[PDB]
Swiss-Prot record, chains A, B:
Quaternary structure note: Isoform H form is a homodimer; the asymmetric form is a disulfide-bonded oligomer composed of a collagenic subunit (Q) and a variable number of T catalytic subunits.
Activity modulation: Inhibited by substrate concentrations above 0.5 mM.
SUPFAM superfamilies on file: alpha/beta-Hydrolases
Protein name: Acetylcholinesterase
UniProt keyword Transferase present: no
Tissue: Found in the synapses and to a lower extent in extrajunctional areas of muscle and nerve, and on erythrocyte membranes.
Gene: ache
Length: 528, 528
């Protein structure tokens, strides 16, 4: 049978699923690591023991323990990101969509979910791999990894909670893909890892990390890069946050063994309930437990690695959305709300910039404010709102990605850059949020192909263009079929827009603002 | 006779002069102070001893000892500013143009020449007061004052060279106007002092200085304000430069008495020959001997005086030209030259910004560079040139003037602001210099009224508009005759353009750049 596959870990049994009036197979919930429960919580992942018999892979696995969004109860805009499965610490599984008939050796795509390293699931409807697997004839894999304290509590020096285990979870799933995708018709020498937000940052972290490089061929990063200001912390800050977490749960804080033992005795929801209480500043776009620059997974600082070319050299395709910051201001900056146009006053503008560049002094805040204020119309509420929005996006996503792409291209073997600015005809979010963080995903996964979802015909056309660029790129190292998406070069720095209009090529994506965030502000903060 | 006037200092005899096919009287070369020669060099001015007999006032007086421009020998563009009279330390005279028939009690205008406090003359053809006196029926006075070391050598604490004597020269001439203009038909209660560049800075200094305020009614400032970065120095820097001047002339430097005695024994050209050797930095738009914040003429710092409203409250009319900085880059920045378009490279751009903000550290230079570079076209030579030009103008003239006008309007009784951007049809300077520092003067003095000078008919029309605005303002406190030049207010901050086109009203003249130069850069330099 086409739904039975024998892997190096045991036999697994899939299920047939319908897609655009046809069908393909799906192997949902395959385990790739032993459940990280009990004394295993916080430890690096251990490889799944093989099993005799047949693993039932017909339904989605549980989602990892995580904080759940409740701002807009029942609002699809936000519920679509919450776990749609029971949560459990037993959550290290992967899902595989396989074209029918089963391929022999075709292109493989592995999706790594985003969610600021504190949330996320591989089972969300927007991550359904069936449309992409089917339309492009690729074997689509989506892995999972521990988030929050479970995946990133870091007490450097300890082997019980070394930090970065969530990344190691991902690596293990990738080790599994490399070792077994052939039995599902996948070509292990042609796997592309792609992810969005923390997923994009993760992809870049596997490009950097020596122990991950050999496990994949190419990479795609959506709205995220490894050097993002919110994606990593030092071992010290990591230690400081683990201790503070312990202090919140009334733990014994005399030794790492004492802290970890206490944290391991707490129920999942107990750690989640106080997780946010450990951030060092009042901030927007900052998360508690994230990857650490430990000297192991990351041999040295990210910047020196990027500067010395100490990373995997291959092709990469990546990009950003127009209004990456809107959602973060909606959730945490005063003056913004889901049901108004959110015109912001000067005072709220200013308190918003403070919230956005948490690590800046006064001189630094003035610099940012000056850089984003139209001084001959300072009380224009639409302008204050939009200016604040660009600040969040530029600082947290765009400029960090631009710095990564410029450093990468100096040593890489091919770069393709995009700027996704199509505002979906069926968006349920207020118009002021524009092209939101996370909303290019639905096009990458092909939702506009299903009529019931209500997209326009041009939007469906856009999704097919994107799906085919991503798949053609994963398969060849070039999104183009032999209108050309130009290669981004250190000299020309070209990129394309990605919407329903005829492709336009541009150059130096947000240079003006990014020279400010990548060169001036750091130098200014380092001297004061 | 109409050419004879009896003053409190003695009788004086004028000469009749032709103007636009008519005639008026002129009293040229009237002394208002004893010659500041010998042991008097560097001392405050002493009032002229009255004379019996008749003073021959039919010819222009000598010009004060000063550095003479020789960049473009015989080039009118630059020669028009050099002294057109023999130079001499005996130079404290004033010139009066009187309408014919002699008025009874009409509006008085006193012109104070510019020239960076190191040069200038009251006898230049562009300062000929006959056209203005005649056309507007005002008694036009032009004074003179010691420049260079002669007028501003400052060894604070000493009474032999206290500093600011050049300003005191001006005050004395104003004291004279106040005491004697009535005999020439002038209304001593209706005198307006107006000046350009250092002259404009001087006008503002008389508004600030308690001992000068009662001597005039209103004020006009052209391309200059008292708080300009090049218009004053501290007593320390002043002292430091006097000593360095002495060290250049091989003087004995053991005491003020020793230094001054030596400096007084040197010939005028000896001090002029080494005058530039004392600037503390490699700079553009900086001059050796300028006014000092001494605690006497200026009771406290200029900024605190402006902040506390410690100044003369009256009406003021003032403004700037579009390309104030061009001439300074022509004369001292690498890459600029009189006969090319001066497209500048990035390197020359950068060395130009260093030269322009002499007192800045590295962080400061980066800030300026970032603020003035179009980062998606950084190698555009026209852009680098123009960006550099605005930097000089914004920092040295425009933003300092905007800061002065905003502080002044908070306490004043009426402000009128202009932006002069007409590029004269007969300009002999290369087109890249635009509307040059000093080129609104010819319109204020009416040169476009004389056909031989070759202006267009619209330019002549512009000059009459300007002459009448200035005169109507001096006479009433309002340039408008009862298209309206709006009053500049703290709230609206309106100003007008001044060219051959229909008046357009605008708001917040260069706010964007000026918030940078008046608030950000200072704060940034003060923290690093
Ligand atoms: N106490 C502060 C905690 C509140 C934070 C909870 C918000 C949940 C975040 N959920 C979202 C994600 C993404 N886009 C959006 C866009 C809009 C709203 C929510 C999200 C793209 C990447 C996956 C996650
Ligand atoms: N070693 C450096 C010294 C060279 C400096 C000498 C240049 C003489 C300045 N002469 C000028 C003045 C003004 N505008 C211009 C415009 C263009 C050129 C020269 C001048 C308006 C204010 C009066 C003086
Ligand atoms: C696989 O497990 C699911 C989980 O409930 C169950 O519904 C389904 O019938 C099972 N299929 C087989 C063949 O065991
Ligand atoms: C990628 O590598 C190949 C072989 O090493 C080289 O010939 C080609 O020019 C490279 N392409 C890019 C975009 O660097
Ligand atoms: C005034 O002095 C000038 C200076 O040379 C002379 O030419 C002129 O004739 C004199 N006029 C009288 C009346 O003394
Ligand atoms: C100037 O002063 C007069 C009288 O003190 C006052 O009535 C008038 O409003 C003032 N004008 C301005 C522009 O301040």
């Amino acid at each position: 049978s086409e739904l039975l596959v024998n892997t190096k870990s045991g036999k697994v049994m899939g299920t047939r699923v319908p897609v655009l009036s046809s069908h393909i197979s799906a192997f949902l919930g395959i385990p790739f690591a032993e459940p990280p429960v009990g004394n295993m919580r916080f430890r690096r992942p251990e490889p799944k023991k093989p099993w005799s018999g047949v693993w039932n892979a017909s339904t989605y696995p549980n989602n990892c323990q995580q904080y759940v969004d409740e701002q807009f109860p029942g609002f699809s805009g936000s519920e679509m990101w919450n776990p749609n499965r029971e949560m459990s610490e037993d959550c290290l599984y992967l899902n595989i969509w396989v074209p029918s008939p089963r391929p022999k050796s075709t292109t493989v795509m592995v999706w790594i979910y985003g969610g600021g390293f504190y949330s996320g699931s591989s089972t969300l409807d927007v991550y359904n791999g069936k449309y992409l697997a089917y339309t492009e004839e690729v074997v689509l894999v989506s892995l999972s990894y521990r988030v929050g304290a479970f995946g990133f509590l870091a007490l450097h020096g300890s082997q019980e909670a070394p930090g970065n285990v969530g990344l190691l979870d991902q690596r293990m799933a990738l080790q599994w893909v490399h070792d077994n995708i052939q039995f599902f018709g996948g070509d292990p020498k042609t796997v592309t890892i792609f992810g969005e937000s923390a997923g994009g940052a993760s992809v870049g972290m596997h490009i950097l990390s020596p122990g991950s490089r050999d496990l994949f061929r190419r990479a795609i990063l959506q709205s995220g890069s490894p050097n993002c200001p919110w994606a990593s912390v030092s071992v010290a800050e990591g230690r400081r946050r683990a201790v503070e977490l312990g202090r919140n749960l009334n733990c014994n804080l005399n030794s790492d063994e004492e802290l970890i033992h206490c944290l391991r005795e707490k129920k999942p929801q107990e750690l989640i309930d106080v997780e946010w209480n450990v951030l060092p500043f009042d901030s927007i776009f900052r998360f508690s437990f994230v990857p650490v620059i430990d000297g192991e997974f990351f041999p040295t600082s990210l910047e020196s690695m990027l500067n010395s070319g100490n990373f995997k050299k291959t092709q990469i395709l990546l990009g950003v959305n127009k209004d990456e910051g809107s959602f973060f201001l909606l959730y945490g900056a005063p003056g913004f709300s889901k049901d108004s146009e959110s015109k912001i006053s000067r005072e709220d503008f200013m308190s918003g910039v403070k919230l956005s560049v948490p690590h800046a002094n006064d001189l630094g805040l003035d610099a940012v404010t000056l850089q984003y204020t139209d001084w001959m119309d300072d009380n224009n509420g639409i302008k204050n709102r939009d200016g604040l929005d660009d600040i969040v996006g530029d600082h947290n996503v765009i400029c960090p990605l631009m710095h990564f792409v410029n450093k990468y291209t100096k040593f890489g073997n091919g770069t393709y850059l995009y700027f996704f600015n199509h505002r979906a005809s069926n968006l349920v979010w207020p118009e002021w949020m524009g092209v939101i963080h996370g909303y290019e995903i639905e096009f990458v996964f092909g939702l506009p192909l299903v009529k019931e979802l209500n997209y326009t015909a041009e939007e469906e056309a856009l999704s097919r263009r994107i799906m085919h660029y991503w798949a053609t790129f994963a398969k060849t190292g070039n999104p183009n079929e032999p209108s050309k998406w130009p290669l981004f070069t250190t000299k020309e720095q070209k990129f394309i827009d990605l919407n329903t209009e005829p492709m336009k090529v541009h150059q130096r994506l947000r240079v003006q603002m990014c020279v400010f965030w990548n060169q001036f502000l750091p130098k200014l903060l380092n001297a004061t």
